[PDB]
Amino acid sequence: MIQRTPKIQVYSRHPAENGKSNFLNCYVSGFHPSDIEVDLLKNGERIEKVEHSDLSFSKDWSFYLLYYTEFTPTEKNEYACRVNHVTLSQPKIVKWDRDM
């Protein structure tokens, strides 16, 4: 058996087709087992309108999850990713660094 802690990256992107849109992205990588809970948070509250989630695996071993949604960042709001996994003793919260 193997278990691996997820690596978590939070960042923003503009689709080149559009430019108008800004997307908040949580990239959760290299984890095992695949059981996982992932949420985007605004000011601490769960964002239930998350339009996109892509899951893949490399070898039979490690899993990769891209979780993202459109958003409009202001200075007044905090955005974060929350991840719970069997390898974590407590949910991990990773805050969005505003120029990433």
Residue numbers in the entry: 0 to 99
What does the paper say about this structure?
A recent case of systemic amyloidosis involves the highly unstable D76N mutation of beta-2 microglobulin (β2m). The D76N mutant is strongly amyloidogenic and, in contrast to the wt protein, aggregates efficiently and abundantly without seeding and under native conditions. Indeed, the 76 position is located in a solvent exposed loop between β-strands E and F. A detailed analysis of the interaction energies of the ensembles reveals that D76 is at the center of a network of stabilizing electrostatic interactions that are lost in the D76N mutant.
To better compare these data with crystallographic data, the crystal structures of wt and D76N were determined from diffraction data collected at room temperature (RT) rather than at 100 K. The RT structures are highly comparable in terms of conformation and B factors with structures from frozen crystals. Although D76N β2m rapidly converts into non-soluble oligomers and amyloid fibrils in solution, the intrinsic dynamics of both wt and mutant forms of the protein can be studied in the crystals using solid-state NMR (ssNMR). While this is in principle not surprising, as loops may feature significant mobility also in the presence of crystal packing, it is intriguing to observe that the fitted order parameters are consistently lower in D76N than in wt β2m, reflecting an increase in flexibility upon mutation. However, in D76N, major changes are clearly observed in the EF-loop, as well as for the residues at the end of the A-strand. In the case of residues 75–76 in D76N, 15N R1ρ rates were so large for low spin-lock fields that the signals disappeared within the shortest relaxation delay, indicating extensive exchange contribution for these two residues. A second mode affects the EF-loop and remote residues at the end of the A-strand, and produces a clear experimental signature only for D76N β2m. Mutation of D76 to N weakens a number of interactions with charged residues. In particular a salt-bridge with K41 is lost and the interaction with the R97 side chain that mediates an interaction between the C- and the N-termini of the protein disappears. Overall this explains the higher loss of β structure at the N- and C-termini in D76N minor substate, thus linking the lower fold stability with the increased aggregation propensity in such minor substate. Enhanced aggregation propensity in D76N appears to be correlated with the existence of a high-energy state characterized by a loss of structure in the protective edge β-strands.
